[PDB]
Amino acid sequence: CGLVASNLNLKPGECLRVRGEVAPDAKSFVLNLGKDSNNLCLHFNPRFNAHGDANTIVCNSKDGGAWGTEQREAVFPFQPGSVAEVCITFDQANLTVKLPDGYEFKFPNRLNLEAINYMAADGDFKIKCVAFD
Amino acid sequence: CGLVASNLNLKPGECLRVRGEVAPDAKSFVLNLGKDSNNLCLHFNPRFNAHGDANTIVCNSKDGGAWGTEQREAVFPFQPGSVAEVCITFDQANLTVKLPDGYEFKFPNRLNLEAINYMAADGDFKIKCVAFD
């Protein structure tokens, strides 16, 4: 189980930058962001080869412990056994997720969060650096 | 409270770097490192003006809830209203804390932790960057 962090106090428009090492055998990794582990405005799950997906990013929310509806993205600029950085911002309508190679996507802010206080990583992604601006 | 991180898995010899903004009217700040809130291999408390102390670094350990024997350092390379980075490693003998302006000191490793898995920050210090390498 990966890094867990709380009291992040990330505000709208502020950039959370996460750089890590994608494992060479990577099947999947997760970045979870929200208020706490039961209230996620972003479950960010790149799947290299996992649960029937190949090279697909699956996103979801979690509200009071209840998962929302999964959203599958159109791009996948990740490779196993490489360094990757992700950059996340939000406003009360959307999260914006910036990816390697100039790709980005928006995911609705379904919880209407005004602060992100919680982050957790899991799976085949070793975090090397977290920055808050 | 400030940032809390767990599952850091910082192994002997590896470097934890923490860069933050010291408040312009800062009185003190704290970085706590260890296993959990009751088991700290390093409580690192720069006091600008707190507890009757001026420009003093106060260090201690905490083992099973018990504060150890407090140690104070001789140098204080911190300024209110500035950016400061501290870099921490450990081996079985000591933690080595590297401060701004090239000062460093050692603090005895009083716990038998295989790794540092927990960090907590508090006080007049806004973390901007945490790196594990």
Ligand SMILES: OC[C@H]1O[C@H](O[C@H]2O[C@H](CO)[C@@H](O)[C@H](O)[C@H]2O)[C@H](O)[C@@H](O)[C@@H]1O
């Ligand atoms: O009254 C609270 C005291 O806080 C400090 O002392 C406690 O916390 C220290 C770490 O910052 C420990 O080293 C110490 O053993 C604890 O008793 C402060 O140094 C004291 O002056 C305060 O009275």
